[PDB]
Design a binder for this molecule. Structure first.
Ligand SMILES: [Cl-]
Ligand SMILES: [Cl-]
Ligand SMILES: [Cl-]
Ligand SMILES: [Cl-]
Lengths: 101, 102
């Protein structure tokens, strides 16, 4: 079922901003807010699977993405309820100027 | 006289977020936004000056901070117009959610 996720007390703005500080990690967050839950395979970035796995590990450890294992799929979800509880209005400002890749 | 700064055409939102993705780098920006132009010496948020020299380097090359040499002093300026013309409402959104560390 659910993969590792930090608690809300352990989420910082420097970690969220670090996880959004990559072209791929930001497109993952842009698509997870516009298209809802998505499996890791829908992200067809032309990058190695070692870099993609680390990207999702950063997304999870930062408090931004909640990943779940249902079958053989890795389902990711934007933890927007928790990010708007700590930082109200931040995700919207980042997604305003986020240009689609 | 004026250290490297990227043109507004080459500043990306991911690069700006990576430069605010450090508690020390975010503290520098929050001080440059509240108290104005500050010198690198007014920020001792590290045991190593190499760690601090790399912080301003990331802030400079990412398009957030402009640094200028005035004698024995490097003065740092927040590029507010550039970050607000490209990313409207982002810096104020980041600054209002930042916890003061000073
Ligand atoms: Cl390859
Ligand atoms: Cl998958
Ligand atoms: Cl001169
Ligand atoms: Cl100085």
């Amino acid at each position: 079922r659910f993969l590792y996720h930090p608690d809300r007390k352990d989420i910082s703005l420097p970690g969220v901003l670090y996880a959004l500080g990559d072209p791929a990690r930001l497109e993952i967050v842009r698509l997870l807010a516009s298209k809802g839950e998505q499996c890791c395979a829908e992200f067809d970035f032309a990058i190695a699977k070692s870099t993609m796995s680390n990207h999702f590990k950063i997304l999870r450890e930062s408090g931004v993405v909640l990943t779940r294992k249902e079958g053989t799929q890795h389902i990711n979800r934007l933890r927007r309820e928790d990010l708007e509880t700590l930082f109200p209005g931040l995700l919207d400002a980042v997604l305003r100027s986020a240009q689609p890749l």
